[PDB]
Amino acid sequence: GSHSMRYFYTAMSRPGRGEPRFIAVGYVDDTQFVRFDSDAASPRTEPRAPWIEQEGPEYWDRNTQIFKTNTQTYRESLRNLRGYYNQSEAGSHIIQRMYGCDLGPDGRLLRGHDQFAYDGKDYIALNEDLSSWTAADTAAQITQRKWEAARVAEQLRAYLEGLCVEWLRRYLENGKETLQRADPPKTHVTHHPVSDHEATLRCWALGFYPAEITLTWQRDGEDQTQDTELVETRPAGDRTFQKWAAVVVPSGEEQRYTCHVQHEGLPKPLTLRWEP
């Protein structure tokens, strides 16, 4: 299947409550495998998936050194961005970074990613070409000029096409029993009368991995997009995810509705109905 590696960094200032917190998490698909938190009693890169534990001492020391350097760099970036936006020293601000690589089903690089946000708004992003930038505003253009002068895009391209892809392939092999195992959803339809006139039909998908799924209701073979209440896919806490889609149907008309399930772990897409 298709796989990706992503790192998510968040630096948050908190004036009057010490220096900005820096947190980094690493994921392979929907599985987190590392964390670093500058607010931990003894900040260090910690394993969060069993297959990463086999990495040696140099791995944990090297990752810690990088995240500790990033902690200092991001506190400087927060100071710079407060000035680029003429903001007072009173408020709390957040910088976020996401980056990583996507591989196709053959293990070949599909594309790289490297983007940033300031206070939850897009700030700067490395374009798909891994050579040019898209700045959201005149403040991000200052960062773009600094990064263009320092050949940052060239270093990121080298990482995204090289080390990102090599480490992702290694993690995929080390954790092949889980990372490369798609667990299909366990599916069922529940019926809940709302009144004498209507009932809710709820189509459940439980125990699936990865998180990507498609769950829809059709009425006489027609998509009920506007009438379906679709909850966000949510983690069960054991690596798996859950999701449901609900439609309110007139009493007696339940057999006109079918629930449709698409998931990587399903050989063929499922069609379910309420089974009274």
Partner: peptide, 8 residues
């Protein structure tokens, strides 16, 4: 493994 590439 993370990258080792900067202040804004």
């Amino acid at each position: 493994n993370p990258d080792i590439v900067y202040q804004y």
